[PDB]
Scaffold this active site. Sequence first.
Site, PDB file in Angstrom:
ATOM      1  N   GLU A  49       0.931  -1.147   0.000  1.00 10.81           N
ATOM      2  CA  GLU A  49       0.000   0.000   0.000  1.00 10.81           C
ATOM      3  C   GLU A  49       0.977   1.203   0.000  1.00 10.81           C
ATOM      4  O   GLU A  49       1.907   1.289   0.848  1.00 10.81           O
ATOM      5  CB  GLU A  49      -0.874   0.008   1.242  1.00 10.81           C
ATOM      6  N   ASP A  60      -4.671  10.609   8.916  1.00 12.24           N
ATOM      7  CA  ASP A  60      -3.413  10.104   9.474  1.00 12.24           C
ATOM      8  C   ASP A  60      -2.930  10.722  10.775  1.00 12.24           C
ATOM      9  O   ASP A  60      -3.012  11.943  10.960  1.00 12.24           O
ATOM     10  CB  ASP A  60      -2.293  10.285   8.427  1.00 12.24           C
ATOM     11  N   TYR A 175     -11.104  -3.003   2.966  1.00  7.87           N
ATOM     12  CA  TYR A 175     -10.292  -2.462   4.047  1.00  7.87           C
ATOM     13  C   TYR A 175     -11.105  -2.506   5.333  1.00  7.87           C
ATOM     14  O   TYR A 175     -12.043  -1.727   5.509  1.00  7.87           O
ATOM     15  CB  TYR A 175      -9.875  -1.019   3.740  1.00  7.87           C
TER      16      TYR A 175
HETATM   17  O1  LIG Z   1      -0.593   3.387  10.202  1.00  9.85           O
HETATM   18  P1  LIG Z   1      -1.534   2.162  10.741  1.00  9.85           P
HETATM   19  O2  LIG Z   1      -2.244   2.470  12.011  1.00  9.85           O
HETATM   20  O3  LIG Z   1      -0.719   0.768  10.797  1.00  9.85           O
HETATM   21  O4  LIG Z   1      -2.765   1.934   9.721  1.00  9.85           O
HETATM   22  C1  LIG Z   1      -2.408   1.525   8.359  1.00  9.85           C
HETATM   23  C2  LIG Z   1      -2.601   2.734   7.479  1.00  9.85           C
HETATM   24  O5  LIG Z   1      -1.462   3.622   7.676  1.00  9.85           O
HETATM   25  C3  LIG Z   1      -2.513   2.407   5.979  1.00  9.85           C
HETATM   26  O6  LIG Z   1      -3.431   1.371   5.642  1.00  9.85           O
HETATM   27  N1  LIG Z   1      -2.724   3.575   5.089  1.00  9.85           N
HETATM   28  C4  LIG Z   1      -3.930   4.386   5.318  1.00  9.85           C
HETATM   29  C5  LIG Z   1      -5.194   3.787   5.182  1.00  9.85           C
HETATM   30  C6  LIG Z   1      -6.328   4.608   5.410  1.00  9.85           C
HETATM   31  C7  LIG Z   1      -6.275   6.001   5.780  1.00  9.85           C
HETATM   32  C8  LIG Z   1      -4.929   6.539   5.891  1.00  9.85           C
HETATM   33  C9  LIG Z   1      -3.791   5.721   5.653  1.00  9.85           C
HETATM   34  O7  LIG Z   1      -2.545   6.267   5.762  1.00  9.85           O
END
Ligand SMILES: O=P(O)(O)OC[C@@H](O)[C@@H](O)Nc1ccccc1O
Lengths: 267, 267, 394, 394
Positions: A49, A60, A175
Amino acid sequence: MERYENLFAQLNDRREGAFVPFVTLGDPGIEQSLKIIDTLIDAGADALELGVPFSDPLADGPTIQNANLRAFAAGVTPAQCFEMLALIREKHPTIPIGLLMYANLVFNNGIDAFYARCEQVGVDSVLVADVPVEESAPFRQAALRHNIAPIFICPPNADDDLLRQVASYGRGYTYLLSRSGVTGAENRGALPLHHLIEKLKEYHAAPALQGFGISSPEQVSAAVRAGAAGAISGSAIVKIIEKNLASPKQMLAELRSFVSAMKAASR
Amino acid sequence: MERYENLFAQLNDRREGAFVPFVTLGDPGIEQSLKIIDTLIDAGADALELGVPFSDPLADGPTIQNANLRAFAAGVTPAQCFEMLALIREKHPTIPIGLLMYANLVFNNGIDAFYARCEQVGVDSVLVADVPVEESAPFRQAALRHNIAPIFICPPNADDDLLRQVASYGRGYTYLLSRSGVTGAENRGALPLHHLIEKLKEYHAAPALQGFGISSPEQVSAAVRAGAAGAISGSAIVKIIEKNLASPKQMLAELRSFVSAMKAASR
Amino acid sequence: TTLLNPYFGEFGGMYVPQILMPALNQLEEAFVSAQKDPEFQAQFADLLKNYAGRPTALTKCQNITAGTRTTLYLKREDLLHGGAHKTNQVLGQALLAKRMGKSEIIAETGAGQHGVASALASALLGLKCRIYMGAKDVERQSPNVFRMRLMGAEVIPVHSGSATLKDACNEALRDWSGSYETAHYMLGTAAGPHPYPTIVREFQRMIGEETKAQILDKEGRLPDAVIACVGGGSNAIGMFADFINDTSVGLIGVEPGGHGIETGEHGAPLKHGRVGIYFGMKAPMMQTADGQIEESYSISAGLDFPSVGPQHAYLNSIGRADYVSITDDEALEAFKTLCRHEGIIPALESSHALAHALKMMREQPEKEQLLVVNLSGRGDKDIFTVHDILKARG
Amino acid sequence: TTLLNPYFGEFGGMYVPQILMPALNQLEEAFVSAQKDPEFQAQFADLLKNYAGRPTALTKCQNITAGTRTTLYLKREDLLHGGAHKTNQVLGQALLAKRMGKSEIIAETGAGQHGVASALASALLGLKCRIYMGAKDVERQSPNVFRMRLMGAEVIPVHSGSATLKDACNEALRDWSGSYETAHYMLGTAAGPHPYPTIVREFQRMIGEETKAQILDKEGRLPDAVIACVGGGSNAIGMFADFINDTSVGLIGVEPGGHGIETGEHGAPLKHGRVGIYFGMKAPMMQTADGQIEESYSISAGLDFPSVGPQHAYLNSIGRADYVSITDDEALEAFKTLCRHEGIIPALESSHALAHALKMMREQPEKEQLLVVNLSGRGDKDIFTVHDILKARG
Ligand SMILES: O=P(O)(O)OC[C@@H](O)[C@@H](O)Nc1ccccc1O
Ligand SMILES: O=P(O)(O)OC[C@@H](O)[C@@H](O)Nc1ccccc1O
Ligand SMILES: *Cc1c(COP(=O)(O)O)cnc(C)c1O
Ligand SMILES: *Cc1c(COP(=O)(O)O)cnc(C)c1O
Ligand code: NA
Ligand code: NA
């Protein structure tokens, strides 16, 4: 292409879950990011990803906010990200590659043009973090026209109508959010997700990958035991980059050790 | 006593007007002020007008505001002023001595007590600058009980009723204002005062002394020619003190020259 | 789906992460319910009248218009409690938060006025208030930060991104994405995801309703135009709303032109930006050619929203409202003119609307026109800024 | 003689140099004429309503009184244009100046609020305004000096005496003694020579008239007491006037106690000074044992008048009004309490009245009492002062 379908079919044959790391493209620089990504793959990542740097990443937490800041300090643009993506696909032909986008970057020069560029470089899926199912029509239509899987987040606060929509509209993988809030390794989701996982399967949704707060091997094994097809870890991976900026070689070694352990837990 | 009456009778016999200087008691200090006053007398002053230092002299321009400030810097109090006044009378038995007061200093420890103290030290008159005829009753009554002449200011903007009151209530001399405004040598009065002077005589008022802005010999001669009994000069005298603070001897010489010239003009 | 339309033509929407959709649907339902509830309406009216001081005056400015055929009135939101129009809608949103059973308030602020208004409404109504403010703004708005804290609000500096308003907007939404069960996000302008543009307009519409009654009483007719500054769009839509169906009344919005549109240092996305999707909505914004979000520049910190409410973009598109811009120097001249000729110190934000009215008058002095400028706030807060500038010049 | 009584019992009078008596008699006659003139009354009412924003709200403070039998209302003069009650009477005095044909205004100011109010009334009404301010005050009130100048007034520093308020009062009278034919002296409080104490009360009496109507509407009865701070006496007499003949209503004036009455560093001449004659009147004052005039100390610069209006000294003497004092620390605590519990930032002057009401409540929490505090002004101007203090302490 059908890269996600091929991966999940292969994983199921080995009674394995997928482990999928997330990083911001170009963090801490283009060359090092390309090296980080090859290390993640060599260490066992089943899919990737990849985030395109954005000025305002509102889903984030601090760890990924800082990854976007480092990539900008390096001058990383969306055009450079697509050049990186083409190279990554040219090196690795079968690994599924999903992007983490924010809407303005997709809408900017035209939604259809964005997904057409994704197809050209070989991307497999796109998750637009600030586009809920209710606003998703033009995005999912353009994705499907260009053979890109549109990914949707299934929240803990979900209901049956939302589950049926996520199952109908998404492709590639679903997801599965571990909890409310924003990304971050310092916050673990503890809500049992057994029910959602079962309803998603009932509605023939794309295989579920659990994400948010996954930072340890036991969480990867727990996600697969609950019925998910795999687990995603972003902030835990990015913290390794942040902690080792001054030592590129140690950074790759620590990423390798972490990914290897996380992937082992999926077996 | 009848010091003003005796002075004016003597002056009229010599076809002379009175010249009366004004200074702030204790400016720039008690000893120097006592020397300044003896110089004014020796140089020809026919009477004296003496100010008691007050915190808020609202009928005075900058020159006299600063004289009050210097006296305060020297620590001069009303009690010290009365001791000075007793000494001045003990040295000069016939010269009329008038005070320039502000109401609060008279009202402070009792109006009657104030005028009784004036009688004890030998003062002849008191002008309370911020007490108009309309508020004058307790002041003029106490003055007369203690053989002190209460002085009233006859303004340029006066009318017949005011002239009759000033004539009836005042004693000693009538203070004929040269102009509106506050004290100051830098502002000369130019309104012909011939009419007022004649109406005051018609109503048997105490002899008129013109004051405010008188700073030159020709103004003294002009006041007497218009029918006034004399002229008062304060700010012009005080400016000589201010200009010569660092040279006490030169200060006395310049005061002597000025007073002598001003007194000569009254003949 | 939703109870009300989330779009104004192509503009608006609900572009938030899926996890926040239930919070927006809950808010919309509570708002629709409250608008039909006479008890809610009476409580809101009581606070506006007896606490905030409504109705606000409508002041005629004869000294400014002498020698011309312009009649100018100022709607006096500068006299509202807190010194700006923002107080109207934070009182309504605080009542909505309580109607939903929420006990905590999250708010974002740039120049600090919305933070002060959110803190005073929260102090009066028993809500725990936390305010996000970009760290560069915290640094230049010490007085307002202290006011918020005296009123019991927690002020949290935001160091991410550009450390200014858009970054505080992001942080507020990040917090809400994990705290919506107990906290209400009290957005500060008529922008953001539905239902906010609609709620904020309805909670500011008494500005235009009072202005219509007051001008009919004093002049016996409606204005030829009503003029308001546009940072995010709340004071302007509050003045415009009740006049939208009075087709003869012109609606003029004034964005900040900063150092000049051609310099690129301005805050006029409606007429000089490009449509994008950010802050939960599809609307015109200040953005790079790549799609990264940028800041709005203006001498007035309160016109710092890097986008604009979707209803304004819509009213522009159909030609019902016209939007213009006024530069820093034009706003400063209007500020000086009102102080000297009417004894009123206007906010520099409001000075942009006044400056455009002065241009309407001065450019065509023999044109008969009845104008109302929304004086959105008072300018005591801008005295240091103005002083520093005039000093720098002499 | 005069048309109206210049005295309130033994207090008051016209202790000015003879040259100024015609100016006072002219002013008295113009005032008596204006009070019978419906056209003057209508013009004054129009400015108060449409320019200044009257009527001002009467706000109930339930959070502050929780757990007690006190009901507290605040009369909101903080919401008047300019941020304090002073605006009411400068508009009336500016209309009087014009009625007499005067084209220039002289005013004195200490903390600067009266100077600002005189400058805004003069800017609106076409009068040339000059303001005298002690140089120590000019130094500590830079913001207010700039406001006056933006409004076109000439600000003249006074370096004589203590270079503070009483010295500016003197300078204003010196100027007027030579300029009365063309200038009107716009005195800033209900003190000074007759007719000023009477004119200022009548031009501030709408405070109490509105409060009486508002409390009857909301509570169906008159207050048990009305409470106001007393610097020179204008806001208090404006609140008191309409209640003087309602014998059941207590009238409580609050002078500043500064660091404590026993320290001698206070501004409470009515109860702790001695009667004297100064500033044109016989009234209680701060003075040395010899009779020299001294300054009033308070954390609040606006309670700096070193004396008090004669009508207050009279109302005290006959027992109709009671006067008390509140220290700097008590006023600061009231300031903090209102900000935190009602979301209102009060002027530190007004905080003295609030502090006494809080004592009335806290000392006898089970006493049923309906109180109104006159909130004479807003406290944005005091934010730096409060901040500095709280910081010095920690
Ligand atoms: O950083 P974590 O808590 O391990 O969670 C994984 C997510 O960063 C990654 O899926 N990317 C992502 C997914 C959905 C919204 C923002 C994002 O940056
Ligand atoms: O100083 P000038 O202009 O020469 O005027 C003379 C006056 O100072 C003197 O009479 N004293 C005096 C008289 C009335 C009021 C104040 C005063 O100081
Ligand atoms: C905040 C502010 C504005 C700008 O916000 P809008 O939502 O566009 O009204 C305008 N005027 C004042 C005085 C403000 O405080
Ligand atoms: C000037 C001022 C006062 C004190 O003056 P009064 O004449 O005693 O009312 C009180 N409150 C405020 C807010 C002031 O500005
Ligand atoms: Na904007
Ligand atoms: Na006082």
